[PDB]
From TrEMBL, chain B:
Family affiliation: Belongs to the RNA polymerase beta chain family.
Organism: Sus scrofa (Pig)
Function: RNA-dependent RNA polymerase that catalyzes the extension of a non-coding RNA (ncRNA) at the 3'-end using the four ribonucleoside triphosphates as substrates. An internal ncRNA sequence near the 3'-end serves as a template in a single-round Pol II-mediated RNA polymerization reaction. May decrease the stability of ncRNAs that repress Pol II-mediated gene transcription.
Protein name: DNA-directed RNA polymerase subunit beta
Domain of life: Eukaryota
Localization per record: Nucleus
Residues of the full protein shown: 916 to 963 of 1300
Coiled coil location: none
Automatic annotation (TrEMBL), chain C:
Protein name: DNA-directed RNA polymerases I, II, and III subunit RPABC5
Leader sequence residues: none
One MF annotation (Gene Ontology) recorded for this entry: zinc ion binding
Keywords assigned by UniProt, alphabetized: DNA-directed RNA polymerase, Metal-binding, Transcription, Zinc
Cited NCBIfam families: PRK04016.1
Localization per record: Nucleus
Residues binding Zn(2+), per UniProt: 7, 10, 44-45
Lineage, broadest ranks: Eukaryota, Metazoa, Chordata, Craniata, Vertebrata
Amino acid sequence: TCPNHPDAILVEDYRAGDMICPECGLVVGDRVIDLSTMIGKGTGAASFDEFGNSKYQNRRTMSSSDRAMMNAFKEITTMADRINLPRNIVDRTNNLFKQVYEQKSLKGRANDAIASACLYIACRQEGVPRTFKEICAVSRISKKEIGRCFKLILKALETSVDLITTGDFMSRFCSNLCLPKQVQMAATHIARKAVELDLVPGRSPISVAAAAIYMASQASAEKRTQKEIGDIAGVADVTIRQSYRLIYPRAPDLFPTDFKF
Amino acid sequence: QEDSVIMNRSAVDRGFFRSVFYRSYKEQESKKGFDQEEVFEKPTRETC
Amino acid sequence: MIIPVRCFTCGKIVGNKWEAYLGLLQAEYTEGDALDALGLKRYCCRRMLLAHVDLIEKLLNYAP
Ligand SMILES: [Zn+2]
Ligand SMILES: [Zn+2]
C-alpha cells in the first residue's frame, strides 16, 4: 500500500515498529500495534436473605447443544484416561465429535455411542488402533451398538480408515504381558509371515495376533497360559485353540532367523 | 571505587571466570482444532 | 571442568602438570612436596594445581 509503488508488499518491522517498503523506505501508518460470567459466593453477609441462599447465583444456561458437547468431552476425557491415551488422540476425538454433532445426522443414537465411536476412529487414525473390546471395557455401551455407530460414522462423515494389520497390536500385547524385546520381534515376524503366506483365510487379525503371542510365549523360559492370553486379547480360549491347531504345521518357517529356542 | 573491581585482562584472556550460558527454547506442534495444524517445515515466502 | 592450559595470573604452562601431580599423590608424597617437584615456585601455579577439581572425569562416566 506504499504510495508511488503500486503492488508492493510491506515488510512489517516488529523491532523498529513500522511498516516499511523494499523499494524506497516510506512508511504507511505511523505505528504498528501488538461469552459469560460466573457469580461466586458472597464474602459479606449483607447479600444473604432471611432464608440465606445469598440471592445472587449463576444461571448457567449456555444453550443445550454446548451442554451436550461439554458432557461429551468430559465423557471422552474420563474414558480415554482409563486406558491412558495421549491427549492428541483425545483432541482428535473431540474434533471428530464436533464434526459429527454439527453434521446433524446421528441424533437418534446416544451421545455416548458417538463418543466411543469417535474414540475408536481417532485411535484408528493415529496408527495405534485399539480393539472394539478394549473400548467396550472402558465404556458403558455394548459391542453391537459401538459397531453400528462406527458403521454409521464411516457412512455419514465420509472418511476412509486404514484396514488394521496384526503388527499394530503386538507391542501393546507383549508389553502389557511383560515380555522382552526378542519375544516382541519374534511374535511380530510370526504374525506378519502368517498373514502373508496365507494360512488364515478370513480369520480375524486379533485371533492370529494372540496366536503369535502364544507362539512366542511357548518357546522360551517364560510361559503364558491360554486364560492370560484371552484376558489380554479379549478373544476366547476356543479361538486361541482354533488358531493354534491351524497354525501349528510349518512352525520353523514362521520363526525369525535366530531366537535361542 | 565504591564497591567495584579492577580485573586482569590477560588473566581473563587465559580463562579467568570464562563461562557459557545455555538457553533452551521449547515448541510443540499443537494440532488441536478442526484444521489448525502447524507442521514443521521451512517457510517459503510463496505460501505462509 | 579440566585443568587450565595456563595459569591465570602469570602464564606458566600448567596443563601438562596435572597427571604427574596425581602420580605424585599416588606415590605417597605430600601436596607441597609434589608441587615443589614440578617447579611451581610462585603460589599462583600452586593455587592452580592444588585447588583444581577433575570434573571431566565425572563427565566421562555418562554415555556419549
Ligand atoms: Zn515504496
Ligand atoms: Zn602461575
